[PDB]
Amino acid sequence: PVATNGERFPWQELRLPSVVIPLHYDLFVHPNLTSLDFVASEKIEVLVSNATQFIILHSKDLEITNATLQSEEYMKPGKELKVLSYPAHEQIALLVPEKLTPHLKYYVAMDFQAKLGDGFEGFYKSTYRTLGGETRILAVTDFEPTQARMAFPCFDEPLFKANFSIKIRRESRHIALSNMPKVKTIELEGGLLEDHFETTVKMSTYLVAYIVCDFHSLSGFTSSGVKVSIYASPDKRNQTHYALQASLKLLDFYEKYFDIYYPLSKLDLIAIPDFAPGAMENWGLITYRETSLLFDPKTSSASDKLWVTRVIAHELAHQWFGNLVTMEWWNDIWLKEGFAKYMELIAVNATYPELQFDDYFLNVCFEVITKDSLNSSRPISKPAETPTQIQEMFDEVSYNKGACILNMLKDFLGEEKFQKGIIQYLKKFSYRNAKNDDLWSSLSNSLGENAEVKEMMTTWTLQKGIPLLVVKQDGCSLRLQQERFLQGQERYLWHIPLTYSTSSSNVIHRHILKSKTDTLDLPEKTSWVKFNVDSNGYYIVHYEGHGWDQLITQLNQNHTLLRPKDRVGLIHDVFQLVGAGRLTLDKALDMTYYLQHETSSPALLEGLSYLESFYHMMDRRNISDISENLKRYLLQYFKPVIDRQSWSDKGSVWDRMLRSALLKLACDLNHAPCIQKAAELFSQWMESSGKLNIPTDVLKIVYSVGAQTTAGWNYLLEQYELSMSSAEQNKILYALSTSKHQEKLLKLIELGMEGKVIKTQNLAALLHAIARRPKGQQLAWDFVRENWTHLLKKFDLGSYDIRMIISGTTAHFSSKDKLQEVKLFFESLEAQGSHLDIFQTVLETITKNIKWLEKNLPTLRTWLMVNTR
Ligand SMILES: *[C@@H]1O[C@H](CO)[C@@H](O[C@@H]2O[C@H](CO)[C@@H](O)[C@H](O)[C@H]2NC(C)=O)[C@H](O)[C@H]1NC(C)=O
Ligand SMILES: *[C@@H]1O[C@H](CO)[C@@H](O[C@@H]2O[C@H](CO)[C@@H](O)[C@H](O)[C@H]2NC(C)=O)[C@H](O)[C@H]1NC(C)=O
Ligand SMILES: *[C@@H]1O[C@H](CO)[C@@H](O)[C@H](O)[C@H]1NC(C)=O
Ligand SMILES: *[C@@H]1O[C@H](CO)[C@@H](O)[C@H](O)[C@H]1NC(C)=O
Ligand SMILES: *[C@@H]1O[C@H](CO)[C@@H](O)[C@H](O)[C@H]1NC(C)=O
Ligand SMILES: N[C@@H](CCCC[NH3+])C(=O)O
Ligand SMILES: [Zn+2]
Numbered sequence: 001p002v003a004t005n006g007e008r009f010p011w012q013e014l015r016l017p018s019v020v021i022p023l024h025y026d027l028f029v030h031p032n033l034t035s036l037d038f039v040a041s042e043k044i045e046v047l048v049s050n051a052t053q054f055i056i057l058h059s060k061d062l063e064i065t066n067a068t069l070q071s072e073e074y075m076k077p078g079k080e081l082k083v084l085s086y087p088a089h090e091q092i093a094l095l096v097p098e099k100l101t102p103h104l105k106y107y108v109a110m111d112f113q114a115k116l117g118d119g120f121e122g123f124y125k126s127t128y129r130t131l132g133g134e135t136r137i138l139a140v141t142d143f144e145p146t147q148a149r150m151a152f153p154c155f156d157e158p159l160f161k162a163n164f165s166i167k168i169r170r171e172s173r174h175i176a177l178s179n180m181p182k183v184k185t186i187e188l189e190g191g192l193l194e195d196h197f198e199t200t201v202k203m204s205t206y207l208v209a210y211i212v213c214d215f216h217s218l219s220g221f222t223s224s225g226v227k228v229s230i231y232a233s234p235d236k237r238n239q240t241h242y243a244l245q246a247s248l249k250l251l252d253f254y255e256k257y258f259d260i261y262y263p264l265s266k267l268d269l270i271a272i273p274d275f276a277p278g279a280m281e282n283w284g285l286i287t288y289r290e291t292s293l294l295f296d297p298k299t300s301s302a303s304d305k306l307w308v309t310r311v312i313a314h315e316l317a318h319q320w321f322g323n324l325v326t327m328e329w330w331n332d333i334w335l336k337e338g339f340a341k342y343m344e345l346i347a348v349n350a351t352y353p354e355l356q357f358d359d360y361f362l363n364v365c366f367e368v369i370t371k372d373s374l375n376s377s378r379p380i381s382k383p384a385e386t387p388t389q390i391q392e393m394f395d396e397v398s399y400n401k402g403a404c405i406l407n408m409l410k411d412f413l414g415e416e417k418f419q420k421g422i423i424q425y426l427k428k429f430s431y432r433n434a435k436n437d438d439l440w441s442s443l444s445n446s447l448g449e450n451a452e453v454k455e456m457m458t459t460w461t462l463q464k465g466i467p468l469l470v471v472k473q474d475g476c477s478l479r480l481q482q483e484r485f486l487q488g489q490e491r492y493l494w495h496i497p498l499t500y501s502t503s504s505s506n507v508i509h510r511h512i513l514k515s516k517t518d519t520l521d522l523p524e525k526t527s528w529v530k531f532n533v534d535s536n537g538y539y540i541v542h543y544e545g546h547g548w549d550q551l552i553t554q555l556n557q558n559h560t561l562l563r564p565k566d567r568v569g570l571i572h573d574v575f576q577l578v579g580a581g582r583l584t585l586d587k588a589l590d591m592t593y594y595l596q597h598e599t600s601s602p603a604l605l606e607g608l609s610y611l612e613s614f615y616h617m618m619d620r621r622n623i624s625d626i627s628e629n630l631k632r633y634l635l636q637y638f639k640p641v642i643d644r645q646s647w648s649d650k651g652s653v654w655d656r657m658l659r660s661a662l663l664k665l666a667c668d669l670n671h672a673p674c675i676q677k678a679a680e681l682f683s684q685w686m687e688s689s690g691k692l693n694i695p696t697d698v699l700k701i702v703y704s705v706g707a708q709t710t711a712g713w714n715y716l717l718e719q720y721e722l723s724m725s726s727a728e729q730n731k732i733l734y735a736l737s738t739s740k741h742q743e744k745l746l747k748l749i750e751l752g753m754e755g756k757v758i759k760t761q762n763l764a765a766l767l768h769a770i771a772r773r774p775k776g777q778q779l780a781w782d783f784v785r786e787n788w789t790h791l792l793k794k795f796d797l798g799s800y801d802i803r804m805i806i807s808g809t810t811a812h813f814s815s816k817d818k819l820q821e822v823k824l825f826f827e828s829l830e831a832q833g834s835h836l837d838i839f840q841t842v843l844e845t846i847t848k849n850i851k852w853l854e855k856n857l858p859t860l861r862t863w864l865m866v867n868t869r
Helices: 240-258 302-318 334-351 357-372 387-392 396-413 415-427 436-444 453-462 547-556 564-580 585-591 601-620 624-636 653-668 672-687 696-706 710-722 726-736 742-754 760-772 776-794 800-808 816-828 837-868
Strands: 024-032 037-045 054-058 063-070 082-086 091-095 107-115 122-129 135-142 163-170 175-178 182-187 193-197 210-213 216-221 227-232 266-272 285-289 325-327 432-434 466-474 477-485 498-502 509-511 517-521 529-531
Touching: 063 082, 063 091, 163 175, 163 210, 175 193, 210 285, 216 240, 227 240, 240 266, 240 302, 240 334, 240 415, 266 302, 285 302, 302 334, 302 357, 302 653, 302 696, 325 334, 334 357, 334 396, 357 396, 357 564, 357 601, 396 415, 396 453, 415 436, 436 453, 466 529, 466 547, 547 564, 547 585, 564 585, 564 601, 564 837, 585 837, 601 624, 601 653, 601 837, 624 837, 653 672, 653 696, 672 696, 672 710, 696 710, 696 726, 710 726, 726 742, 726 760, 742 760, 742 776, 760 776, 760 800, 776 800, 776 816, 800 837, 816 837
Parallel strands: 024 163, 227 266, 266 285, 325 432
Antiparallel strands: 024 037, 037 107, 054 091, 063 107, 082 091, 122 135, 135 210, 163 193, 175 210, 182 193, 216 227, 466 477, 477 517, 498 509, 498 529
16 A cells, blocks of 8 residues: 555565665765755665665655666666655655676665754754844754664664765755864855865764754864864854863763774764753754753753763763664664663763762662652563554663663672673674674673573563562571562563671671572571672562661661661662552651761762652642641751751762752742842842852752742743853753742743743643642643643653643643543643653653552651650
């Protein structure tokens, strides 16, 4: 079957035929930034394997005005082809008047043209405010995973790699960047210019990139030669200094660690005004949101720095993981993304150990654990089809779990061995693709008895959920039962490595596992044991017997006798099992007593995080009695440390993080003093007409405070537009979402639609923010529900944007009622809407909420009332 206008389609599967193999693209693009469109011409050197009468490749909203196939041997320049367009598979078929012949190299060549894109996809238009207040346009690309086909027709699968020779034509007011460095620039008749770029190494289509803009740069050189350059609005070249330092340090590290030089002469990182993802790893031309790449010590904070450091790291890691060695297909996307999410950890701890990213990392896992503890979860490695499924593939599973199980795996195998493991892997696939299994093999092979590692990871990657490992203590024999962990199954088995210490020697007893059930003996009767040291393992431990109580009392006596990640980890599981139903809320709440002794901010903050979480539940629902005693228990306890915090920016990262943490908790809870001081700094800053410097750490706090008066709110929105700091704007906007006036917030949400004052790219994040506040949880839900039509014009489902606009506004619900209006909306979404897996997840989550409450709510009230006495 087929289309468009009559005539039939030679190929009826959404994948492409292996027959016609692409070897090289010649790619010319003539964009116009006034006309706001482009004209283009390409020339693909094919290579048939089996003779055939028709050629098949991808194309999308591309008008093709000339199709030929020249011969190199058959025929002299050059026969014309018949173009068949099948949209519902975003394919076009070429028609030859003469079947081709195996083992022969041809040249398919077409002329095409389109308008510059609307969205955040393909070859699209973006703008930005100068310091003068001028709006300015530029042209940029985003091809992952299925969008190179909207830019130039091609074989848009990650497996069909090729060389790419791009030529860009431009006004003299602009510059052109692309993956490779610029060979030359010729002038043209009318004073037009044409840039020629080094031919790329073999590489997938989704990684091709080109850009026209009038940006400025800071350049530098990695010790191994490469010219790193940070590109941004000319008014912003200052914020690009950190980006440069770190890129440099990082590329240096990577080359050494991976023991593979980065192939290209140059590496550019550019800060795109309008950019949907946080960044795109385009080889030699990595795009970023300004908030991922730009840093301004006046406005950028502890966390900020850490995060931009983080995404720069993550993106440079891609130059190897993904770029050099590309997964064969979007099912094992995780291979690219989990390994990159992981290498984050390594390289930053490596180069910037002061950022102390390690103590953080776990959160990456804790958070995936939250989503993996549902039935609506999935296997890191899964079948993928429609472009939409592919997009759905980009999530916490592929990213975080992937990064976590790898980390676990590195524990079982050790750095030096794991490092070797990857060096090999990379080199064995340089400039090509690799399969899920391919990786395991290259790792597990780093006598004469065998590293069976495969089995282990193979269960991890290919099935849902996360293991719960209950342990029973009877003198010197410990019962081990492994279950699928869920949050209130049958058929899951994990080769889950175990770890554990005892109250005795602080030494790490290891021991694998691969059966539904096993047992182990303890060399000496001991107080307590703690399985999964440092929490380096992707699983949970439940302590039946006095196992739980023993650990908790240990925490109140001499807690330092516990690893600070054990502490952290413990806190985590305790509260999770309370949701599992296996524990009762009082036990967890009781752990939170030792927190007055806890100096590991990691733990101190995690504990606090949960207490904080409960107050917020109570607050949304009207539950005034609990939320107010919780506020009180929070102010009173912790008032020691709360009152120890300086409205400054001194101390280590965690010291700063802790400061902002607490001081927020304080102002959020209305601690008169703090909320007065904050009030002060703002009125000062505002009336000093911006001259006064609020410390970046308390920055959000002050802004969010000053936003309570319509006087301040109106100054901040005014202040927002003029700002040159992506980072400051972020914080202003946040502070804007802390108003209590419906229309005020409503305004924001609408300005997000508009997308002229507040870029649409923020629409999700913003919505999410408002839905959080009790005031706006309704507004938001209303809006999304009402505007799902126009929303879907602006974004794709399932774009991460749409995906999070959905959950962000609903995932926090906890009533039977809300759970229907959602359930119902998801039914409604069921023309073009249905279906996103997030539809399930969202519900599974709202049920878990109602449950957790009806289950554990009464327990909360008494537990608190108890303290009051
Ligand atoms: C895109 O088209 C624009 C129209 O805005 C081009 O500019 C006109 O081009 C002709 C030939 O260069 C000139 O005679 C006019 O003076 C231009 N008008 C303006 C307002 O500049 C522009 O060259 C194109 N952009 C590119 C370089 O591709
Ligand atoms: C297309 O890309 C390849 C690399 O993917 C270019 O280079 C060859 O790559 C191998 C493998 O790393 C190197 O060892 C060789 O030095 C390169 N060979 C050559 C030709 O020098 C290759 O040159 C590119 N081909 C085109 C069409 O330019
Ligand atoms: C191409 O040829 C190979 C070997 O001759 C064969 O395995 C394959 O089926 C052919 N492709 C098709 C489906 O025509
Ligand atoms: C982090 O780096 C330090 C040295 O810089 C090292 O001791 C530690 O092993 C690293 N953490 C891991 C396991 O990556
Ligand atoms: C636990 O507490 C004691 C006294 O309260 C303290 O001096 C001791 O150093 C702590 N134990 C350890 C090993 O830190
Ligand atoms: N690969 C990108 C995500 C971009 C996906 C959408 N273009 C990253 O590392 O975050
Ligand atoms: Zn990535």
